[PDB]
Short mmCIF file of C-alpha atoms in Angstrom, two decimals:
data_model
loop_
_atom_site.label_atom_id
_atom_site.label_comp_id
_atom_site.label_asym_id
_atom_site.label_seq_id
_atom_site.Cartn_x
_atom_site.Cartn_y
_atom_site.Cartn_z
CA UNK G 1 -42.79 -45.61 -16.01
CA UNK G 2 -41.65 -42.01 -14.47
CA UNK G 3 -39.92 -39.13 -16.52
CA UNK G 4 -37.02 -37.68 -15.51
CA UNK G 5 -33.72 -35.54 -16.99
CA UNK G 6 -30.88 -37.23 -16.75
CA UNK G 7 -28.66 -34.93 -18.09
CA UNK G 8 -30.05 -31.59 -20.38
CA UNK G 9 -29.30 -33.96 -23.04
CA UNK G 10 -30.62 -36.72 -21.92
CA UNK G 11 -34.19 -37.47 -20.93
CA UNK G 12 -35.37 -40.46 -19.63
CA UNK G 13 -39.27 -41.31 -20.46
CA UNK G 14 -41.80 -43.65 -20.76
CA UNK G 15 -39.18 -46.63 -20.95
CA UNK G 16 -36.74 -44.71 -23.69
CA UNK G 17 -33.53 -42.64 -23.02
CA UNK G 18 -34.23 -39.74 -24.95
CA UNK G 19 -31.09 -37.97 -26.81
CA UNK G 20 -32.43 -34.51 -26.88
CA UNK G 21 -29.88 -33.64 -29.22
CA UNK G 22 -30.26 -35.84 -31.91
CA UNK G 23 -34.54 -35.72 -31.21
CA UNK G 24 -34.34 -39.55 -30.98
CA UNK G 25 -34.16 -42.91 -28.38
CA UNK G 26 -30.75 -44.03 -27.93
CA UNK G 27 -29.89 -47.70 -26.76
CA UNK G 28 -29.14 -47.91 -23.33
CA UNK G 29 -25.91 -49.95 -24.09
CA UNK G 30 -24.47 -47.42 -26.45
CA UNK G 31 -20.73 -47.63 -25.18
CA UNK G 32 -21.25 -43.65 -25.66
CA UNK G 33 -22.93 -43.48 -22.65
CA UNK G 34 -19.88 -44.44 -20.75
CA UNK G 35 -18.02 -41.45 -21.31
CA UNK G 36 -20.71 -38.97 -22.48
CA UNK G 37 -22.55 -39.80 -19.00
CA UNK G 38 -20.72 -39.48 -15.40
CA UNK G 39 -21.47 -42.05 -12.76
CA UNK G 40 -24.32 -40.99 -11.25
CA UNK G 41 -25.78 -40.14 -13.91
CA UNK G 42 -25.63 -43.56 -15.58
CA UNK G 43 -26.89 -45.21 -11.42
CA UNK G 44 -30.25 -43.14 -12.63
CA UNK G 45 -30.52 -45.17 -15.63
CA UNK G 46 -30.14 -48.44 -14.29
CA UNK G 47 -32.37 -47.79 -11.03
CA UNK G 48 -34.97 -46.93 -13.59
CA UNK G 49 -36.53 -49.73 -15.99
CA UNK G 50 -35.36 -49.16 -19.77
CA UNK G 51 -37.02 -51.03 -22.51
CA UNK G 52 -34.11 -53.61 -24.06
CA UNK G 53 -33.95 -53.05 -27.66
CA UNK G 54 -33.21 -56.25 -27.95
CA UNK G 55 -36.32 -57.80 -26.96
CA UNK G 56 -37.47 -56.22 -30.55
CA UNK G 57 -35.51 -57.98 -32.77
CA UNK G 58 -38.10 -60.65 -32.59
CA UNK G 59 -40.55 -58.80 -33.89
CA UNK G 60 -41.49 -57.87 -38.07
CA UNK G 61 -44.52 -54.91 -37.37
CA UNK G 62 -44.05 -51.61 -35.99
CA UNK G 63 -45.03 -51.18 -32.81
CA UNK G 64 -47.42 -49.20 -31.43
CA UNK G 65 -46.93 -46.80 -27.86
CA UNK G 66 -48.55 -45.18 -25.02
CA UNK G 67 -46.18 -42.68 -24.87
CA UNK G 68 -46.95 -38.80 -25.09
CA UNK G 69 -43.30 -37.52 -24.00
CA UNK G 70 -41.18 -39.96 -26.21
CA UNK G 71 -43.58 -38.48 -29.40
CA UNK G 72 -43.30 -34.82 -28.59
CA UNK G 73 -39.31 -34.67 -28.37
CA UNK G 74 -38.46 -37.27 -31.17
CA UNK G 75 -38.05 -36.88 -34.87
CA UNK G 76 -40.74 -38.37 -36.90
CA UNK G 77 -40.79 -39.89 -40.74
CA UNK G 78 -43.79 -40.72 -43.05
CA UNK G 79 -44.02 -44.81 -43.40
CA UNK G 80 -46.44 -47.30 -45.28
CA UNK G 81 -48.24 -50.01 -43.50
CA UNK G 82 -50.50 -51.90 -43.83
CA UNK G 83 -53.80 -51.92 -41.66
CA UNK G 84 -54.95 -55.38 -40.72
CA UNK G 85 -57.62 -56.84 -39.18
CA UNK G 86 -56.38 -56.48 -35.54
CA UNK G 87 -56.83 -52.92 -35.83
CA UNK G 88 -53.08 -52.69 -35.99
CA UNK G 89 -49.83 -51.56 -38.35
CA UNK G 90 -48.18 -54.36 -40.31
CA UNK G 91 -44.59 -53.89 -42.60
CA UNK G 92 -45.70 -53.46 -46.17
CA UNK G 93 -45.40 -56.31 -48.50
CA UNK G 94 -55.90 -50.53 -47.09
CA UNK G 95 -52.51 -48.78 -46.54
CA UNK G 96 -52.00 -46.14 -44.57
CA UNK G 97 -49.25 -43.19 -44.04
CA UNK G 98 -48.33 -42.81 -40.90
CA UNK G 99 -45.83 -40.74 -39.06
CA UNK G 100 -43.24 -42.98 -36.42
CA UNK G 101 -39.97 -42.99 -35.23
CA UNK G 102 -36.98 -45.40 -36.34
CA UNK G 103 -34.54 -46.90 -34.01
CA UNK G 104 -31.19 -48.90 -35.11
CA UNK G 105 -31.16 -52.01 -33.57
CA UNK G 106 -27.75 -54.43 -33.13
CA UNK G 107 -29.71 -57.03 -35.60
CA UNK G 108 -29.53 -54.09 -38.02
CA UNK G 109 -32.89 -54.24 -38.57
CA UNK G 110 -34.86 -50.69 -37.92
CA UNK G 111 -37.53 -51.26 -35.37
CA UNK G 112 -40.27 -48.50 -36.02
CA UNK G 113 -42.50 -47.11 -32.72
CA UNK G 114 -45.76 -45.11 -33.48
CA UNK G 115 -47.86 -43.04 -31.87
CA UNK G 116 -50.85 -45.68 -30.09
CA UNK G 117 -53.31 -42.63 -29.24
CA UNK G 118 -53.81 -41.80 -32.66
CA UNK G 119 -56.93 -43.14 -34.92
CA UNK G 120 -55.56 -43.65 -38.74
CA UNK R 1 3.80 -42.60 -39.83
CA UNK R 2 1.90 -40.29 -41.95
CA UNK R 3 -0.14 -40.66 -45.37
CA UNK R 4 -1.58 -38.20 -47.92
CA UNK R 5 -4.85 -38.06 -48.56
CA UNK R 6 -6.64 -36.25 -51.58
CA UNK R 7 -9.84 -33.47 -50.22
CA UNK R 8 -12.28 -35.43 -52.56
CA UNK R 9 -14.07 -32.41 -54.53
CA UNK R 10 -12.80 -29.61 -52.89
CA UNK R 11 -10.58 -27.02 -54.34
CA UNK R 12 -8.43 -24.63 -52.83
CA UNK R 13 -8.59 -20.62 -54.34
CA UNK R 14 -6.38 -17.72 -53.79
CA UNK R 15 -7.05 -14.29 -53.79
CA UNK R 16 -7.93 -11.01 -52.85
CA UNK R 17 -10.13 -10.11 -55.83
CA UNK R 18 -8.93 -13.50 -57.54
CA UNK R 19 -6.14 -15.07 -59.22
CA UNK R 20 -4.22 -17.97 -59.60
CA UNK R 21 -2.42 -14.09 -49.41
CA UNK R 22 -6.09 -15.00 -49.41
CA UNK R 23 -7.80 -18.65 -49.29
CA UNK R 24 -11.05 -20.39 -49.05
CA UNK R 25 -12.26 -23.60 -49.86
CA UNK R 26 -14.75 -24.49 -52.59
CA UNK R 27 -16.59 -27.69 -53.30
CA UNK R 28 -17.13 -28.72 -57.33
CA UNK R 29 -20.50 -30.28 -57.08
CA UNK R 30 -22.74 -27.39 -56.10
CA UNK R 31 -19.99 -24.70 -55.17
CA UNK R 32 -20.42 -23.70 -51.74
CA UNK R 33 -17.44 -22.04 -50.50
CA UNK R 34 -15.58 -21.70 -46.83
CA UNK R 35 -13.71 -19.59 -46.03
CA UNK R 36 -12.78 -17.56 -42.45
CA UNK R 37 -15.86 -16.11 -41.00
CA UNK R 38 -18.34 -18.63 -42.26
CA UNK R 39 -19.72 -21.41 -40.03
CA UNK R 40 -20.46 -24.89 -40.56
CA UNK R 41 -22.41 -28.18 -38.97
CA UNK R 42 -19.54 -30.98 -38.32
CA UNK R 43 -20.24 -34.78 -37.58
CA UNK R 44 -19.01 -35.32 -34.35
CA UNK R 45 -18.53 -39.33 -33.89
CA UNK R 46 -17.64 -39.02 -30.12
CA UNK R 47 -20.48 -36.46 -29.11
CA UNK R 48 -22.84 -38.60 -31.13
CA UNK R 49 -24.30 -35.58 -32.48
CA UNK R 50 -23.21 -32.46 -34.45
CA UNK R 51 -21.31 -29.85 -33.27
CA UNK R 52 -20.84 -26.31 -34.94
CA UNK R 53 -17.78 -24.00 -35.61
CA UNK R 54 -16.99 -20.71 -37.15
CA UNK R 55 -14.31 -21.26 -39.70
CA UNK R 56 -10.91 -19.64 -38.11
CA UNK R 57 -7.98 -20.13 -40.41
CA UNK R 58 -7.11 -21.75 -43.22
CA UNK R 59 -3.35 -22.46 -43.17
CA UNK R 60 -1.67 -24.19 -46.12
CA UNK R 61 1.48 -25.17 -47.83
CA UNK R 62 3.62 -23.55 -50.08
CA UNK R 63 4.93 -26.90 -50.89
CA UNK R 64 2.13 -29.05 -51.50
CA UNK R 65 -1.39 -29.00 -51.75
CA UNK R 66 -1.75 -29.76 -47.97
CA UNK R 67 -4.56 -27.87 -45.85
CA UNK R 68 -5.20 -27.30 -42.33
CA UNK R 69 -8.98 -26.66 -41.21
CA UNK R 70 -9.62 -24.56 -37.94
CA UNK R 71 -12.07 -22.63 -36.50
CA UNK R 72 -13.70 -21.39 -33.05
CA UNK R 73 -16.20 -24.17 -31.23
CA UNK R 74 -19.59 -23.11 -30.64
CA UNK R 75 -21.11 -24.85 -27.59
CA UNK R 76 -24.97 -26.31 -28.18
CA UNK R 77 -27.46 -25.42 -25.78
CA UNK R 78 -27.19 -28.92 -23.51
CA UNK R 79 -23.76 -28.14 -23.23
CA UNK R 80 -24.55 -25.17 -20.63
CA UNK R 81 -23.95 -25.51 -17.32
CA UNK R 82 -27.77 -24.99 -16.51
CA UNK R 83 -27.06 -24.03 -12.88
CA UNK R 84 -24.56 -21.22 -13.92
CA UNK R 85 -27.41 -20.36 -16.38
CA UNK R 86 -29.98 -20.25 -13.67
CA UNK R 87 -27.63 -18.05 -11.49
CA UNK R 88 -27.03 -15.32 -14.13
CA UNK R 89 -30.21 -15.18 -16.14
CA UNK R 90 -32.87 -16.06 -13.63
CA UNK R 91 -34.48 -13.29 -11.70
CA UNK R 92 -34.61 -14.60 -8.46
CA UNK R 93 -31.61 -16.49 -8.50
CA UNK R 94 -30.86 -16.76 -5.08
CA UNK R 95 -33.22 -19.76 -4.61
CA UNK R 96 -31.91 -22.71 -5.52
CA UNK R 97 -34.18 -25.42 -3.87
CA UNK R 98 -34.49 -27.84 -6.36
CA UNK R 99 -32.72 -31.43 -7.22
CA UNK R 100 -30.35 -31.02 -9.97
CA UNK R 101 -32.76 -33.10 -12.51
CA UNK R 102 -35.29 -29.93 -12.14
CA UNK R 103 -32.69 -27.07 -13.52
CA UNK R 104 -31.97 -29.68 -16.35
CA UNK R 105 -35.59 -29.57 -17.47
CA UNK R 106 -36.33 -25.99 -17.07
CA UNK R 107 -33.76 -24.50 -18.87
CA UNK R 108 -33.95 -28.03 -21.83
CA UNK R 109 -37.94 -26.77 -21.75
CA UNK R 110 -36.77 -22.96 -22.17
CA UNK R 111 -34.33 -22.62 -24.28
CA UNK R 112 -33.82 -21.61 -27.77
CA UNK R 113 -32.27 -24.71 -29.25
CA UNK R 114 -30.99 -23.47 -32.13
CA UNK R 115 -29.57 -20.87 -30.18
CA UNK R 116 -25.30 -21.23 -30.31
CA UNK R 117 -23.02 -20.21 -28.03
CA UNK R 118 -19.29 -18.86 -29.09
CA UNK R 119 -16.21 -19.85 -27.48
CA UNK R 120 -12.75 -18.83 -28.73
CA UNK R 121 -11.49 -22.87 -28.53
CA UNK R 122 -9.81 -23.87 -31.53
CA UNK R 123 -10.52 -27.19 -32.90
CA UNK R 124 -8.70 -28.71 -36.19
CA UNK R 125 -11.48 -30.03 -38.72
CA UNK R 126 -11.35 -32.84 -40.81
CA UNK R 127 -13.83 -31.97 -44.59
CA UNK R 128 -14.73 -35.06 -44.86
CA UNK R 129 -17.22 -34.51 -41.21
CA UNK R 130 -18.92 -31.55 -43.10
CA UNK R 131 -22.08 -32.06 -43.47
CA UNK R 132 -23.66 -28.48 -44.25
CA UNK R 133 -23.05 -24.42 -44.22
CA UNK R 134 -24.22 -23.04 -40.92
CA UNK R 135 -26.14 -20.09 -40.75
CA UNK R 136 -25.10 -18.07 -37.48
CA UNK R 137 -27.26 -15.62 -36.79
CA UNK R 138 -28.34 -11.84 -34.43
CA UNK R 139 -31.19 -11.90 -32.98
CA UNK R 140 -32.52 -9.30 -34.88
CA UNK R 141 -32.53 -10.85 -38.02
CA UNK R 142 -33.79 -14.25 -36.15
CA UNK R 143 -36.84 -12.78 -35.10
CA UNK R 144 -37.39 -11.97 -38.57
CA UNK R 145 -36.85 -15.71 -39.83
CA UNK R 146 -39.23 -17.21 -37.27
CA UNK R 147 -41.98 -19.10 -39.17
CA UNK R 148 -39.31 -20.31 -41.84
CA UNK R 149 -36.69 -21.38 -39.74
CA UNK R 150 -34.84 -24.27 -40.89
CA UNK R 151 -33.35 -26.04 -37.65
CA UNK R 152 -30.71 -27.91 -39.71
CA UNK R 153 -28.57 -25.16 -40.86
CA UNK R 154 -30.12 -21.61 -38.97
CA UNK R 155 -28.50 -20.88 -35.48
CA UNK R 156 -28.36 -17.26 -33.43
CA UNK R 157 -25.91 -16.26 -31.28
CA UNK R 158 -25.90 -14.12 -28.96
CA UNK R 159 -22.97 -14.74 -26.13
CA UNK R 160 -20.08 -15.91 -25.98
CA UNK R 161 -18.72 -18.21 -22.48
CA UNK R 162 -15.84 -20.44 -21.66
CA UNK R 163 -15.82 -24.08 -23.05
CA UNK R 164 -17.17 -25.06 -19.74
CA UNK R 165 -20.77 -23.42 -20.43
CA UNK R 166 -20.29 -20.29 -17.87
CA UNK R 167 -19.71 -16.50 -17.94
CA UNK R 168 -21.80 -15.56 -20.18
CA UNK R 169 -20.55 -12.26 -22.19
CA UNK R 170 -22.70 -10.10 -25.13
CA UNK R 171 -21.33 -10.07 -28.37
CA UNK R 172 -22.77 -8.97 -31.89
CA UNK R 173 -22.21 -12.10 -33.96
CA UNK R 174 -22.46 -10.05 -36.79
CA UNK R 175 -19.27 -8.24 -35.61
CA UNK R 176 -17.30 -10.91 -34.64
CA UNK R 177 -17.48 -12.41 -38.40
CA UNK R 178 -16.69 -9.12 -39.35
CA UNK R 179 -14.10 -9.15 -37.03
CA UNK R 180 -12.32 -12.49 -37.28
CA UNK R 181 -12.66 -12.56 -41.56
CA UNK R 182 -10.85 -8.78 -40.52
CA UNK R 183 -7.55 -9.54 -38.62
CA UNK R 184 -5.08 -12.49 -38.18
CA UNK R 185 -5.66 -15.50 -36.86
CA UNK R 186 -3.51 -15.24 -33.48
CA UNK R 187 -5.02 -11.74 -33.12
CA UNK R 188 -8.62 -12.62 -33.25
CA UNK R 189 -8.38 -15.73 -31.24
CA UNK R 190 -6.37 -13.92 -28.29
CA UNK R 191 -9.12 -11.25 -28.31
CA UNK R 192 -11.84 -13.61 -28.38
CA UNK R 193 -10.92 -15.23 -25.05
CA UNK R 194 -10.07 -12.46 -23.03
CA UNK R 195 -13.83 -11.33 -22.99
CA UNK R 196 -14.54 -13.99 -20.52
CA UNK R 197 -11.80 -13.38 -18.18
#
């Protein structure tokens, strides 16, 4: 994974396309893209390798990142979760409050990223 | 091909010290008022972000009820051109070595983003895409509010620059408000884009 700006809006890093502007990821298939972003720009993106949001639907926990760029420009929320066993964050229904960011999927469901380097 | 719609909790009022040509908008619930002059935070569905204005006019009807929103566009820091930036800010401009991607970080990494920038385009706007007053700033009294800045509705401006993000020109936001909640419409508009020409 390699940082780069794509755009000053933009920001591509560790596996996310950062919208500056909002202080949040953006899916790479927002049909946004296609006119907020001119050709070249959008070649960068797909020569580089973007996380599918997809691939999270499958999953029910937050999930938990090696990423110290994506956590210093995105907007972050207080959540409850649950600490297991595994030493990891589980949805709700030994809790902690922990600070992550939320991304719309297509499913509808909110997938929810937190910061991996931190001890709760 | 047209319908009327009713401006859901908003009220027109006329004045000049009250009464029943002067106008500004006012919202029931909590009261805030617009009116020429003032600026506000829009929802902008294409951009995929919010975009600021400076309330221009507010033309209505003698007729009917009917009203008009307009007002100048502000442009948000990622919407300058960062290599015109560069050029006119930078102190040894002359160099410019470096792959586009690198003047996109340094001046994202630099600047003030909360910092506005006028522009005398017009732009017709639709109430029910307010989302909150704006509070447009000198940098005077923004130096003051650092430490209790509150990045969702407290912006400084200090130039003004074609829609384009270039030619950047000095202006005292606090006397362009004066200004434009001063003259007429037309007037104030035609001024406002001949400082960048």
């Amino acid at each position: 994974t390699e940082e780069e700006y794509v755009s000053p809006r933009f920001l591509v890093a560790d596996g996310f396309l950062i919208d500056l502007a909002e202080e949040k990821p953006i899916n790479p298939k927002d049909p946004r893209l296609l006119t907020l972003l001119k050709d070249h720009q959008r070649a960068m993106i797909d020569q580089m390798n973007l996380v599918k949001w997809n691939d999270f639907k499958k999953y029910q926990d937050p999930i938990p990142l090696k990423a110290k760029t994506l956590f210093k420009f995105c907007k972050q929320i207080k959540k409850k979760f649950l600490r297991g066993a595994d030493f990891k964050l589980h949805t709700l229904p030994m809790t902690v409050l922990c600070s992550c960011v939320p991304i719309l999927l297509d499913d509808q469901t909110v997938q929810y990223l937190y910061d991996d380097s931190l001890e709760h | 091909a047209k319908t009327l719609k009713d401006l859901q909790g908003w009220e027109i009022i006329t004045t000049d010290e009250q009464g029943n040509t002067e106008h500004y908008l006012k919202r029931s619930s909590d009261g805030i008022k617009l009116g020429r002059g003032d600026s506000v935070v829009m929802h902008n569905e294409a951009a995929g972000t919010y975009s600021v204005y400076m309330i221009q006019e507010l033309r209505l009807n003698t007729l009917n009820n009917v009203v008009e929103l307009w007002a100048l566009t502000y442009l948000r820091w990622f919407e300058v051109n960062p290599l015109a930036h560069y050029r006119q800010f930078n102190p040894d401009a002359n160099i410019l070595n470096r792959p586009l991607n690198y003047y996109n970080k340094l001046f994202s990494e630099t600047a003030n983003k909360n910092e506005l920038y006028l522009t005398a385009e017009l732009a017709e706007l639709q109430l029910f895409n307010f989302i909150r007053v704006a509070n447009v700033m000198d940098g005077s009294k923004w130096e003051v509010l650092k430490g209790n800045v509150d990045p969702e509705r407290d912006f400084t401006v200090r130039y003004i620059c074609e829609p384009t993000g270039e030619k950047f020109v000095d202006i005292n936001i606090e006397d362009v408000k004066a200004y434009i909640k001063k003259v007429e419409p037309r007037e104030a508009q035609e001024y406002l884009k001949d400082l960048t020409l």
